[PDB]
């Protein structure tokens, strides 16, 4: 029974790290990437926390667990992942692992503790269950101030980017690191196998860091991508609507967007420091050499691509792609360019730990890819499936199928679907849904989507077959 | 088997008519009110079309029929009322009624015809089923024009109020009347009992009429109510959000709101003319003397009360109250001040027509009240129940319980409930939810709400018992 | 809030009493019949304990409560009525009744107590929930002895009829009476309204009584009915199979069947004594003059009609008909010949006691009939609906519709349905299902059955529409 | 896309063949066993046709497909496998296989044809769907004749064993072979990949063969096993009851049981001839060298072990074990002694044929075992899971877990479970369930069963946790 450590981050993009030729020097994450298996084409299940984390920890899609929206936020109907869904936490406990959890959970008050973990520290540790959804009255008021031409301290906009007072040592991130260190120190003194999860709120917006991280990337030198700040042409209406109050970006100057980037980059630099602190502790405690590690982001984050901020009900690569490194100390490092999914994390843990199966596995173990490289998937279609059933109480039913060359997005709450040619239009600027030159590609993607919905027993296949009847 | 005629209107308020001391002379509706049973405290089930109409025609709440949102609109998940829900239409057909339908249906393409009616004319008559939701790209563009300081013809704002070209004879309303006349003429030549439904889109916004109705009420002379144009204090966040694009009323001048009223009043005057035309035809065809008539609005309409336009996920009296007249030619006219519900229409039709029962009746027959007056309900609590599960793809789960003196609104997708003292604050300006002086009233209303949710087997009772635990 | 007493008996036939011109002098029950409302055409919902009692106490059919088989018996899948089904017991407790229960419950261990009653005494009072089904190894062994030509003490067959040692004072029946007396004496000392249920295992087989009841009816003088001991002609196979081990009656002589009658009659004589003891106690305690009383049998019992013993999956009148007397001290006594149902008991209690509604009422209040006589139902079809979904782990799906003149039984687990002309063949000897002279009656009964299944939302309507396609 | 032939037999035991050292010379089946992969410890999913065949063809357990009883038989509630369950038949058709079906289907009228196969010949081919259950009036009458001391032609008992008139050429088996030959001859003329299923009613009882098979095995020379004709000691009551009318074996002499063996052996001899005819046709048509073959029995058959005949709700090896040979022409022959399951057939077909996944796979592909031998399962628990939810309308909920050394049977409709030490008591004579010497084994098997029920999402896990509370 191997020791396992998961380092989970909130809205951490695939592309920022120096090992991906990104703009932030991340030597600790780069070292882990170089020692482990790089999943460079990893895709989340949903660009939203609770659905992505339920999928990650249960290995099933939201229509199977019922966890298909964020919990505890205006105006979601959901409060918690059912206690019948024990997840990898309870499964590991059942075969004698000591499981520990630190930080962001967002699957219901006390959840890790109710499933047998030591919930050492985090927002949800001492909360009562069935609480009222958090309703963003303060964010609403502050975005109205931004629209009225007000700014916060030092001309910042604290619903978007913020200099935190103090130092790294004062941060939530440092507290989570300190609890992670305690978790590792305690594990080293136990005869029981260890499964530890350290889950950081960073780099979730508003993009916030203390000095020196707040000023380490000059906003004036940020390279903005080809899809930055464009008017969306022939995109679905759900990309227009102000779902969360900060999604009104009408007041954002180019300077504001550049600062959103420079603060995000500072947050990634601070995350790199946090990862180094935990890896150094694992080494000092004699756990590192045999430690099976996953580093993953729950989804990405929009920094003004398509004039969007944060996240919402859509399928753009900046949100859909996630960073993923899986380090198995028994394997030679490899780079995997086959697409993989958040649904593949639970089966990988299941194979590592010989977890009992508690039900379906909607994904596949990544061990074959970690052992053999891309050739493990010889003869298989290179696809990923993404869902966006709900955004905080709004129903969308979104499904996307992504190949290396194309993406098809079904928006069943709209009349407008999306079709992107990722080979010629990797920035997803041009919706080709109405372009007859793409009839063969759309037909193929519709067939692949129907097959996936059938495989996972998604009840929206009935509606899909109506909407796409011309292509079946 | 009596002949039955339903005259159904879309967003027709309880209060406009001259028989209710309202500002519009409505002699044809007044005459029907004076000949029939006035339900002066009638309440809709939901301030939204498809849920209210499914409840009206099936006699069950949306959680039982599955019809708990509008159909066919961005971003609802629903397309049609299940064909397993035959409604009063199929039930009447099954015992030998000739059923006819004209006008607005909004329960799925071809629905009345699929349930055995002659669907003589209307939007949904020749539409394919399972169509894509109508997504309001044009309304979105036009509201952006209004926010940019543009206006339409003659300085109007055609997403709010509009002079139609031509005359009454050119209108959808006149076409629906003409088909209603044909329906009555045909019924008079048949030996079979008749059940006819004429369902008008009027007075649904934008508030539109031709001359002379467009100019018959001077906007300068409109009396605006105490809750007109106020800033909402301590109200739920769902009252703030721009659900449909025209809900952005930030560009509306007092003149614009006054014109919304004067065009609405013109629409009610035109409806009165339409009702007269159908009643005169019933008289000319020898059907009127034995004709059992229902005149009802599916819900009201907001004309700037609480600075709200049209409708949305809320429970204010201007939307929740509905006009209702039920004329049984065998009964002396009476005014009923006991509250009644949209759920009471199907059981009243069931008693009139001896319809077979196809399942639960969530309401009660109104015949006892029509026969005896208010004393029929001696010893019963005077309550009404209102739901707002969904608004066009947004989930809210709203429940309201209303007594003559108080209203309690549960907003389970928010942290803020509502409590109104209708005796001291009939305009519902002051939310008393946090006022300890109302602890007894809130406790009583919470107990009444729990009992109603139990009675109708609403699965949200579990969440209710958590949210309201302090008062149970 | 009136005081209510229910006297419930297990397998007590409609016809044994002297007030029904039956063979047993029952002066106490006759007196109650003469003082109350006689429902002389009452019908149980199912000829099996747990389903009948769940229907009685909840007012909903088994497909709605899930309680569609006996609990706790080989080889039923069921253990208890869900605690979400509070029944009239919890509903009465909720409005301030003191509810007390004595004797047979058979709806799950501790059930009356878990729903707020004082469970004073009875088999289920101190039992653990979720116990293993009682499997009749002893009965199996003893019926094998009977088939081998053995007899029990005094030549009796103790799986069919038995002389108990001692006297009435030593019996379970006397203990249940004594607890009933305590219940009434305690109720007389309280100002709180009283709801008491005394539920007797008598006269459930084996038919067992002490002297002098054991020898009170001479077996040689028993009048056997026209359908006694016949070979079943063209009847469904479920009437042939040995479901419970004592259903093998191949070893029964005519003397054994006569003695099963003698002992059944002795048990009815002892029941009449028990009823007298409780009514006399109510009189002595000053409760009788205002006491609202129901006396009912859960179903009948087969004494060799169609060569059947006890009960099983079938719909014969001797099992389907039930005794019912409802005494409302405010009403003149009347005889009701309209059919009524076990589903009508909960709504009658709900009207008497002003119980809150916890859901559907599949039956109707009997107060209108108790007040007006048969004319209350002028213009209603005189039908009863009977179900036999399960017998102790065997699935049958049986439905029967009964009119004063005809009975149609659907046996969906068989190829043979039943059709009886009760006018010309009240003993139900001749199955007319294939007789084209009865095509009009069968068609009418099929239509009535389809209507009833639709009304109660019985999911077997789909299969019914296949099986009866020729008749719809 | 390889060509696939399935040879399926009805109630064919694992042990009769000469390759298993059994009493019948079966050179054709032995040759296939010697050329292919022998699964000598194969286990069916249920000892009943429709459930076993639904599991075989869908790769999911009955609680997932709803196909958990025989269809079309007194007194099952079921008529057909849902057409939403396309099975391997529709999945193979979807990727361009020509699928053909001959013989016994027993999953609903027309089922193979409705799923895209050429249903060449068989009982279900031209039948109407939703027919009334076959009710065994003839068998009931004839078993009554046997109990009255009558015999059939030549002193036979035709509900148990029967000489057919004519020769092999006149048999149903020869017709099924002849259609199988046509299927192979037609497949040889197509370039399209072939998937053929030939499903024989033999050797289902009554055990029936023409000469010379009827007299080939001398009944006087039959070797009877150690568990033949014993009185069952401390066994569950469902083993005693006469579920199907021929289960009354009280009239069977030792000669009658010996002849049931003689005729069963004659039927296996005739099956070996049938298999030879199809394999020889495959060779003559040039298909054999690349033909991927499965030969399997749906379950075994009881020949008087524990004094049982045919099958019923129980888990004895003679019924639970099944013959299985899988021949992949690309692989070296191997004998597999690891247990395998009927749930492993669909995934094996899915791997051979690259079938799309239509949902869960409750089993595993057998290719790794076929390639590597038993070592493929190194470090896996050697278990099999068996269910007996229903027998022809009787509910039993039975679950069995089997290891090489032990078997635990949960009988939730009884108070008696079973525990067999297969090492010391391979004939399953001694129920050890109450033997404290076996507490460790029972505890381990209970844990393994709980894990399996959780893995397949069997809703009976809730009741299992109550019944087995002492052991969890
Ligand atoms: O596999 S595990 O994660 O160890 O958990 C299994 C099973 O998957 C899980 O559903 C169950 O959870 C039970 C279930 O819901 C909540 C919890 O207790 C309740 O009473 C229900 O039995 O726990 C099992 C392992 O115990
Ligand atoms: O009561 S009615 O309105 O006359 O309709 C009843 C019943 O309520 C309704 O559910 C049923 O509808 C059937 C059902 O769904 C659609 C329609 O056909 C399908 O095949 C199903 O049988 O119709 C009955 C009366 O026929
Ligand atoms: O109407 S009552 O008989 O008073 O009971 C109601 C309701 O009908 C009943 O379902 C509920 O039972 C709750 C329910 O299951 C058991 C009990 O507690 C659980 O937690 C569930 O909420 O009790 C109410 C009265 O409170
Ligand atoms: O995978 S397949 O065997 O090819 O079948 C799939 C799917 O698994 C199956 O459920 C579906 O069956 C549809 C479904 O029920 C019957 C049939 O038509 C109905 O309208 C429903 O949509 O068929 C697909 C292949 O198309
Ligand atoms: Ca996130
Ligand atoms: Ca921080
Ligand atoms: Ca599944
Ligand atoms: Ca599927
Ligand atoms: Ca409306
Ligand atoms: Ca109009
Ligand atoms: Ca209901
Ligand atoms: Ca309820
Ligand atoms: Ca009984
Ligand atoms: Ca007794
Ligand atoms: Ca119904
Ligand atoms: Ca079989
Ligand atoms: Ca044959
Ligand atoms: Ca599970």
Author numbering:
A (entry chain A), B (entry chain A), C (entry chain B), D (entry chain B): 36 to 507
Please share excerpts from the published article on this structure:
The polysaccharides in red algae (Rhodophyta) are primarily mixed galactan agars such as agarose and carrageenan. Carrageenans are high molecular weight polymers having a linear backbone of repeating D-galactopyranose units (G) linked together by alternating α-1,3 and β-1,4 linkages. Furthermore, transcriptomics revealed upregulation of the CarPUL during growth on ι-carrageenan, while biochemical analysis of eight CarPUL-encoded enzymes revealed carrageenan-specific activity, thus associating the CarPUL with the ability of these pseudoalteromonads to liberate energy from carrageenan. Detailed analysis of the enzyme activities encoded by the CarPUL, combined with interpretation of growth phenotypes, have allowed us to propose a refined and detailed model of κ- and ι-carrageenan processing by some Pseudoalteromonas species.
Despite extensive efforts, we were unable to circumvent generation of this inappropriately matured form of the protein. Therefore, to provide insight to the specificity of this enzyme we generated C84A and C84S mutants and attempted to determine structures of this protein in complex with neocarrageenan oligosaccharides and fragments thereof [Supplementary Notes (section 4) and Supplementary Fig. 10a–c]. Taken together, these results support assignment of S1_NC as an exo-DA2S carrageenan sulfatase that would likely have activity on any form of carrageenan having a non-reducing end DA2S residue (e.g., ι- or α-carrageenan).
